[PDB]
Write a protein that binds this ligand. Structure first.
Ligand SMILES: [Zn+2]
Ligand SMILES: [Zn+2]
Lengths: 370, 57, 73
């Protein structure tokens, strides 16, 4: 209403004036389904510059910090009705920030329905459930015979809202949640996405089996990139499209410029012979017309594989990849080490994204492309 | 408390640049009969059922 | 009845008949009727979440009773 006779009732129903002279108000204030005790003594007149306002200790702990604003608002705010509206808004804000603090799950609807539904799935499936019962994790199997997990995070209200789904696989997983849907529904969707992506798994498994995969070491299921090692001190890195795995991936070659050239040339000339009915390896082998080593000895073959400046492997994710174009050195480096080195020396000259210089060990012309 | 009310206080100094007390109040079960503190934000409390523990760390 | 394992829970020890042997405290049976059971995770999983659910639900019950008596005042 307009006047503060009924509008106050309608906007703060649970503040009941105790005294005849409407000077003592007492009762409850509502915010996000929670009634808070409140007692608001006015002076003989309707002025808020000075008024008493006592609370429940519940309300004090919830009005921690905002003490300055309410004291300020008492002085700046014209009417009591508006003071209550404004106070409610701030208490709303305060609880909205403390949602890590005030979170609960209903015992009836929740725990039972969840137990029914996990039974509906089957207990071979479930692998992990948290003691707060928020997080659960489920398992599924490929037709190829691979285990893939799916994490769900559940709110106080599971069937109302979506539960937070976390899945490994690399294409963005889309889950049509309805209020009618349940874990079995999304599970069927999860298997469906698995069986769609089936080809990508099969490709990456064939690569990780029959090749010395290098730098996604122990790769996750999300990982789409594969730096394959081949010959010695040269590598091909490969990015693969999940929707079209058998299709040609983006591939190129690190190592010695004099060694790399016949690989790029031979690829370029024979690439029309690529065929998307075979496997990636079975295509690459007759396309590049070479074989791979299968674990020659992948932990130590016979090379100090360290940077030969920093004498480490694994500087900040980076691998020894930049090498010499020389039979006698063949010394790997890191991008960072060799860059800082060449950028110092007087001999070096920088074109656009390239720096030419002398290999530290052998003093032969070495190129670095940033 | 006895009936199971726990209270917690910490120094915040956040969001305004002044020290503000961040209070909680938990409602842990059972009429607490005893408790003590353990090194590393741990509390051992006891209900007439069990001795339970709480990790604040 | 006593805690002989030293786990933090009482157990029952049962001595079976003397017809077996003329030797003391042979043929024992220790049990808790829970997990502990000596003698001579599809279902074990979801119980802790259920116990916490019971306790929390009880705390919510006591909270509502408090809220109610406040409102009556
Ligand atoms: Zn290095
Ligand atoms: Zn060199």
């Amino acid at each position: 209403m307009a006047v503060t006779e009924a509008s106050l009732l309608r906007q703060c129903p649970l503040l009941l004036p105790q005294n005849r002279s409407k000077t003592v108000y007492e009762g409850f204030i509502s915010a996000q389904g929670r009634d808070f005790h409140l007692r608001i003594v006015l002076p003989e007149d309707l002025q808020l510059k000075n008024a008493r306002l006592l609370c429940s200790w519940q309300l004090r702990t919830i009005l921690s910090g905002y003490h300055r604003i309410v004291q300020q608002r008492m002085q700046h705010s014209p009417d009591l009705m508006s003071f209550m509206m404004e106070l409610k808004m701030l208490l709303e804000v305060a609880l909205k920030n403390r949602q890590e603090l005030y979170a609960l799950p209903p015992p009836p609807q929740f725990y039972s329905s969840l137990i029914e539904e996990i039974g509906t799935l089957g207990w071979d499936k479930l692998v992990y459930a948290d003691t707060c019962f928020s997080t659960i994790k489920l398992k599924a199997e490929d037709a190829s015979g691979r285990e893939h997990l799916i994490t769900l995070k559940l709110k106080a209200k599971y069937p109302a809202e979506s539960p937070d789904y976390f899945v490994d696989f690399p294409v963005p997983f889309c889950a049509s949640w309805t209020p009618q849907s349940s874990l079995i529904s999304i599970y069927s969707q999860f298997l469906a996405a698995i069986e769609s992506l089936k080809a990508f798994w099969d490709v990456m498994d064939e690569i990780d089996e029959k090749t010395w995969v290098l730098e996604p070491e122990k790769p996750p299921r999300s990982a789409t990139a594969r730096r394959i090692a081949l010959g010695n001190n040269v590598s091909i890195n490969i990015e693969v499209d999940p929707r079209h795995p058998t299709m040609l991936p983006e591939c190129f070659f690190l190592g010695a410029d004099h060694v790399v050239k016949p690989l790029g040339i031979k690829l370029s000339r024979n690439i029309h012979l690529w065929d998307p009915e075979n496997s990636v390896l079975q295509n690459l082998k007759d396309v590049l017309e070479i074989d791979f080593p299968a674990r020659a000895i992948l932990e130590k073959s016979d090379f100090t594989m360290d940077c030969g400046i920093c004498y480490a492997y694994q500087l900040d994710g980076t691998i020894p990849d930049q090498v010499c174009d020389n039979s006698q050195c063949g010394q790997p480096f890191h991008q960072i080490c060799l860059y800082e080195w060449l950028r110092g020396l007087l001999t070096s000259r920088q074109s656009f994204n390239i720096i030419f210089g002398e290999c530290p060990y052998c003093s032969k012309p070495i190129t670095l492309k940033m | 408390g006895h009936h199971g009310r726990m209270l917690a206080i910490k120094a915040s100094w956040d969001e305004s640049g002044k020290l503000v007390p961040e209070l909680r109040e938990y409602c842990l079960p059972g009429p607490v009969l005893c408790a003590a503190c353990g090194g590393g934000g741990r509390v051992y409390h006891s209900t007439p059922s069990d001795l339970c523990v709480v990790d604040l760390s | 009845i006593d805690d002989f394992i030293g786990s933090g829970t009482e157990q029952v020890l049962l001595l079976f008949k003397d017809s077996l042997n003329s030797d003391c405290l042979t043929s024992f049976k220790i049990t808790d009727l829970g997990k502990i059971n000596y003698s001579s995770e599809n279902r074990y999983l979801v119980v802790p979440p259920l116990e916490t659910g019971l306790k929390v639900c009880f705390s919510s019950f006591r909270e509502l009773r408090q809220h109610l008596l406040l409102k009556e005042k």
